[PDB]
Design a protein around this nucleic acid. Structure first.
Ligand SMILES: [Mg+2]
Ligand SMILES: [Mg+2]
Ligand SMILES: [Mg+2]
Ligand SMILES: [Mg+2]
Ligand SMILES: [Mg+2]
Ligand SMILES: [Mg+2]
Ligand SMILES: [Mg+2]
Ligand SMILES: [Mg+2]
Ligand SMILES: [Mg+2]
Ligand SMILES: [Mg+2]
Ligand SMILES: [Mg+2]
Ligand SMILES: [Mg+2]
Ligand SMILES: [Mg+2]
Ligand SMILES: [Mg+2]
Ligand SMILES: [Mg+2]
Ligand SMILES: [Mg+2]
Ligand SMILES: [Mg+2]
Ligand SMILES: [Mg+2]
Ligand SMILES: [Mg+2]
Ligand SMILES: [Mg+2]
Ligand SMILES: [Mg+2]
Ligand SMILES: [Mg+2]
Ligand SMILES: [Mg+2]
Ligand SMILES: [Mg+2]
Ligand SMILES: [Mg+2]
Ligand SMILES: [Mg+2]
Ligand SMILES: [Mg+2]
Ligand SMILES: [Mg+2]
Ligand SMILES: [Mg+2]
Ligand SMILES: [Mg+2]
Ligand SMILES: [Mg+2]
Ligand SMILES: [Mg+2]
Ligand SMILES: [Mg+2]
Ligand SMILES: [Mg+2]
Ligand SMILES: [Mg+2]
Ligand SMILES: [Mg+2]
Ligand SMILES: [Mg+2]
Ligand SMILES: [Mg+2]
Ligand SMILES: [Mg+2]
Ligand SMILES: [Mg+2]
Ligand SMILES: [Mg+2]
Ligand SMILES: [Mg+2]
Ligand SMILES: [Mg+2]
Ligand SMILES: [Mg+2]
Ligand SMILES: [Mg+2]
Ligand SMILES: [Mg+2]
Ligand SMILES: [Mg+2]
Ligand SMILES: [Mg+2]
Ligand SMILES: [Mg+2]
Ligand SMILES: [Mg+2]
Ligand SMILES: [Mg+2]
Ligand SMILES: [Mg+2]
Ligand SMILES: [Mg+2]
Ligand SMILES: [Mg+2]
Ligand SMILES: [Mg+2]
Ligand SMILES: [Mg+2]
Ligand SMILES: [Mg+2]
Ligand SMILES: [Mg+2]
Ligand SMILES: [Mg+2]
Ligand SMILES: [Mg+2]
Ligand SMILES: [Mg+2]
Ligand SMILES: [Mg+2]
Ligand SMILES: [Mg+2]
Lengths: 46, 271
RNA sequence: CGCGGGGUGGAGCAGCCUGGUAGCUCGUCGGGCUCAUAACCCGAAGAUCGUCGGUUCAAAUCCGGCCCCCGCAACCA
RNA sequence: AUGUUCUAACGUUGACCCGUAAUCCGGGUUGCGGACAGUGUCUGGUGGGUAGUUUGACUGGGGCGGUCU
RNA sequence: AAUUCCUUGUCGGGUAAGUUCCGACCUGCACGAAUGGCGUAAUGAUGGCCAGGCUGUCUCCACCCGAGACUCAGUGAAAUU
RNA sequence: GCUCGCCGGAAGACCAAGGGUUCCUGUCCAACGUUAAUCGGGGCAGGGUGAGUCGACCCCUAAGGCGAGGCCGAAAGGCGUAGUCGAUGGGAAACAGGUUAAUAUUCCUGUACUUGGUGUUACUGCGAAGGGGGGACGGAGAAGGCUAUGUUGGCCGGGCGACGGUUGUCCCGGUUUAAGCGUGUAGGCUGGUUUUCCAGGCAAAUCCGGAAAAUCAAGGCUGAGGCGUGAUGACGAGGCACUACGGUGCUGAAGCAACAAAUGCCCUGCUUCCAGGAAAAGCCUCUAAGCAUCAGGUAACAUCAAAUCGUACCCCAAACCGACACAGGUGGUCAGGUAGAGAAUACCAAGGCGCUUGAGAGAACUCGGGUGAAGGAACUAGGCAAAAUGGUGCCGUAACUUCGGGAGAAGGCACGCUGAUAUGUAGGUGAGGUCCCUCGCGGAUGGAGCUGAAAUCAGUCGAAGAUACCAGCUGGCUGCAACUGUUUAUUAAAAACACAGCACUGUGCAAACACGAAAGUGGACGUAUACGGUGUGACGCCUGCCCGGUGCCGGAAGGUUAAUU
RNA sequence: AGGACCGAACCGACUAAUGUUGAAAAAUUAGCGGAUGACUUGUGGCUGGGGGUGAAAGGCCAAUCAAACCGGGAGAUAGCU
């Protein structure tokens, strides 16, 4: 039976990618928090 | 004409269709078409702002000439056509200079008829004149509200307005609703009633026929829960309250017109 | 099991609440009018107020018990 | 105070011209309205559309009934 | 009565025997006219009842074919305490 | 290796998504694999993905996004014009054979095609951010013409049979070939050509649209398939030689016809209906400004270029989504035989598998099935479950009805095989031959050959002929809802929701209404025969009385009454 | 012609049995409904939490819904265990 995660690379990048984060100030704030914490993988692009 | 279907299935028993044999059967005139994709009742926020709209058949917009501002050049009706965007039929006319245009088809118009607009046009159905040149008592349609703006009143199938009086710079009109309204006498009007007067005798016959026109189902307020509608709730069928809209406004009698700009032009309300 | 309202000429209703006094319509009885009856007109009679106790100078009336009458409630279980 | 007229504020989701290669916007001409409409402050009415809350205790279990000095 | 408490009302039909069913009666605790009334052909993985066929549903179980259960070798949990 | 079993509209073969080395070779077996493992999608090492034509990238746009200025907003920001992005759609071009352990429309062989640059020659009006054409579009239905494909015959090679027969109407196998190029056929659409003029296409136009003459009556466009070539080639059964036993090398016959035939192609066609069926570019054409013995355009030839990224492998799955090597889910394409209406079902082909614990035994009891004396719903809340019916053709079929239905009502009869009618019929297809002409992929006649039901009569076997698989139980009364639909993903599918129809009511357009501090947007590029809200719910017969209460609508004399003064 | 009929693919989910530390955090087996349409499906897009969407069940909004999830106020408060 159909589960919730149906992978799609294009939709993944368009929803959570780097350029989607950078497009709004709240996305940029997400990136700032993740840099301050020190995540190795900053977004889903990597 | 008006044709009843034979009851060979439960979805056909009550269907009444209006069929016109004189409508064109080919494709429409390509230079006068545009696309118009559907909204779903959604506005630019993406929210539903009008309910019960969606789906239906794909349609192409026919550019109809509502202004009729090509004066002094006679035109000939080429063919009547079906228009999916409105209840009336539209006629394709050809001007003596080689230009083609769509107009609302008045009652009695047929291929080969002569029409023309302007102040000197003859008093015949399909001709457009400023309303100060049309005799008092005439039946006109596609009436303008501001000079040069384009016709806006009496555009549905079978409708018309009547010029009841003329006094100075204004003419008094009787609209289909029964309201008596005052309009500038330089506005244009087209003589005669809008054609396809039997459009209202149509019976859809089944739910799908309404879904083909992009109408989605209406859920009654009493069928919901109180969190959804003021009418919701109850053990069994309970109403016990004054009828209102989904947003709490009384919906049987309460008047909603509030416009003081245009109150000066209203001579009588429709009653 | 429990609350609320009632019992007044023969019938249906007032008067009770602020205890001093019983009214209204119909019915009954007597007389008229009519050939006669009904209708109509005139006059009169008729209830000690469910019952038993209390309070009071005085109880249909206020308080209590009892006998009937009606209504409501009797849920979660 | 009311009414009538006017135009110059103001409106125009009428027409035309320009920026312009543009059904936004702005500027210009003209028409139509016109001190109305509309907006700000103050103010009466309405307002489960929305919001914050209250809705007693005793009790041979609680409710109903009764009670509370 | 998808509504009737008393109630398995009463009468009729069906059954050997029918608190259900069908037809009536009217005493409607507490139906009723677009929070529609009364009918209604066709339709329904809809509710109730009856009949024919059919049968291991049952009287009342018997035998048989396979997968486990049982024994041997290998691997090897769990709730609980 | 030989037997046996299973799938075969998949449990075979490919694409897309998704994964990312799982692909191939050598080696190892500690851990992983529900057991052992010498094996593995495990560990370690090495190898492997080749493009002008496939895809991306590229040009073009849809929904939608972003959005210079702009409008609007306490700030953050919201919306939107010019623009610019965004495929799931439009736009140039390649096929066959061979080859690796692992890639191939990419490598090799053969044969092709497209776009662009440059140069030369010949001729010449070129030119756009503008005009026009085109691209360019629905559902259903009906054929007619074909092919893929299959069957049979012919031909070629081989065989003469473990047990009765088998030199023949016998058995096995093969009988294949592309793009391109040339023909322009079945068939579809459309009259053509030349002048003259014109309020139209924002200006111009020789282009498109319109008008009037003259003339000719055939021109044009599209088009599957066949045929010829490609191809004296390649491939090819099978032989002959090596094998270091996985296979390598050489050679290589026939390679035809008839019939049947798609859900594929002609066909973006045709017919019909209403619910009336993208856009933009590439492309063709027209001119403006401009240029002008230039530039540019057209044609032929020569030459150069076509970059970059993907390409292994899985892909109804042990590699994707489900924590698992998980009875689940996952879009598109291909589509053999016999029977059959069929992509159902049964047995098979090509191909692929036997599902990663076995061995015994033959207790109760549980699960999944088979059969059952006599009875036949007595069971039970209830015929739950099971049993039963089940096909085709013909006969026959009630109440009721909205005249369509009910209806497959109910019920019944025939059904195999063999022969004859008829050495194979009615029908379908169709060669040769002959005769014509605008001569060709032509017309007429002609019928050899091939294919071929259905029926009747007669006979015949069995208990049984729709023999398996497959495949309605039927009728009677009644409540509710008209009906097809929808719903509580995961205890409720209904009488609930919806519905066509009905009524009330609001709404005159900058509409009411809704989303939004606003600008705006939807309603609607709609205009009262329209749009919103509410209730009822096909259809038939109907829908009675009450305006005291509450609400709404209208009124505006009087009483009361805010800020203000 | 048809929200026509019978019936596979496909989309559902009416009944029964099994399973219930399952093969499976909703399935399997045998039957069952629709199956040219108010049909189904791929890819992309839009609507955001007192908000959306809802042929309406308080259904659905990532196994979570009479108010999602994550972080913060925060060591909320707890006459209670
Ligand atoms: Mg609506
Ligand atoms: Mg409606
Ligand atoms: Mg409900
Ligand atoms: Mg409410
Ligand atoms: Mg009720
Ligand atoms: Mg009530
Ligand atoms: Mg007397
Ligand atoms: Mg007294
Ligand atoms: Mg509240
Ligand atoms: Mg608080
Ligand atoms: Mg208490
Ligand atoms: Mg009872
Ligand atoms: Mg009886
Ligand atoms: Mg009865
Ligand atoms: Mg009722
Ligand atoms: Mg009424
Ligand atoms: Mg009803
Ligand atoms: Mg149904
Ligand atoms: Mg053991
Ligand atoms: Mg343990
Ligand atoms: Mg098999
Ligand atoms: Mg391997
Ligand atoms: Mg070992
Ligand atoms: Mg092991
Ligand atoms: Mg490995
Ligand atoms: Mg856009
Ligand atoms: Mg924007
Ligand atoms: Mg800006
Ligand atoms: Mg682009
Ligand atoms: Mg694409
Ligand atoms: Mg390979
Ligand atoms: Mg063929
Ligand atoms: Mg590959
Ligand atoms: Mg396994
Ligand atoms: Mg699996
Ligand atoms: Mg699927
Ligand atoms: Mg099969
Ligand atoms: Mg056994
Ligand atoms: Mg058993
Ligand atoms: Mg049996
Ligand atoms: Mg036997
Ligand atoms: Mg038996
Ligand atoms: Mg027997
Ligand atoms: Mg019994
Ligand atoms: Mg019993
Ligand atoms: Mg059953
Ligand atoms: Mg059975
Ligand atoms: Mg009943
Ligand atoms: Mg229904
Ligand atoms: Mg459920
Ligand atoms: Mg608007
Ligand atoms: Mg209703
Ligand atoms: Mg159907
Ligand atoms: Mg079906
Ligand atoms: Mg569902
Ligand atoms: Mg269910
Ligand atoms: Mg099933
Ligand atoms: Mg059906
Ligand atoms: Mg509820
Ligand atoms: Mg959920
Ligand atoms: Mg809350
Ligand atoms: Mg704090
Ligand atoms: Mg705490």
């Amino acid at each position: 039976m159909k589960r919730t995660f149906q992978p799609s690379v294009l939709k993944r990048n368009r929803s959570h990618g780097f350029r989607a984060r950078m497009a709004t100030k709240n996305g940029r704030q997400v990136l700032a928090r993740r840099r301050a914490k020190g995540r190795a993988r900053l977004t889903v692009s990597k | 004409a008006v044709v009843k279907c034979k009851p060979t299935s439960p979805g056909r028993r009550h269907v009444v269709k209006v069929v016109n044999p004189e409508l064109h059967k080919g494709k429409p005139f390509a230079p006068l078409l545009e696309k118009n994709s559907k909204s779903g009742g959604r506005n630019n926020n993406g929210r539903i702002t009008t309910r019960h709209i969606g789906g239906g058949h794909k349609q192409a917009y026919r550019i109809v000439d509502f202004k009729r501002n090509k004066d002094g050049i006679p035109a000939v009706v080429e063919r009547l056509e079906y228009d999916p965007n409105r209840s009336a039929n539209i006629a394709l006319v050809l001007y003596k200079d080689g230009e083609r245009r769509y107009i609302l088809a008045p009652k009695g118009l047929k291929a080969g008829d002569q029409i023309q607009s302007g102040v000197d046009a003859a008093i015949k159905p399909g001709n457009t004149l400023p309303m100060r040149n049309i005799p008092v008592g005439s039946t006109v349609h596609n009436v303008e509200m501001k000079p040069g703006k384009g016709g806006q009143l009496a555009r549905s199938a079978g409708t018309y307005v009547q010029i009841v009086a003329r006094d100075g710079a204004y003419v008094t009109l009787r609209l289909r609703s029964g309201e008596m309204r005052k309009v500038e006498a330089d506005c244009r009007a087209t003589l005669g009633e809008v054609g396809n007067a039997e459009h209202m005798l149509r019976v859809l016959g089944k739910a799908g026929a309404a879904r083909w026109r992009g109408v989605r189902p209406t859920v009654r307020g009493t069928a919901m829960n109180p969190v959804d509608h003021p009418h919701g709730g109850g053990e069994g069928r309970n109403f016990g309250k004054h009828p209102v809209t989904p947003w709490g406004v009384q919906t049987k009698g309460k008047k909603t017109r509030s416009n003081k700009r245009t109150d000066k032009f209203i001579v009588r309300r429709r009653s």
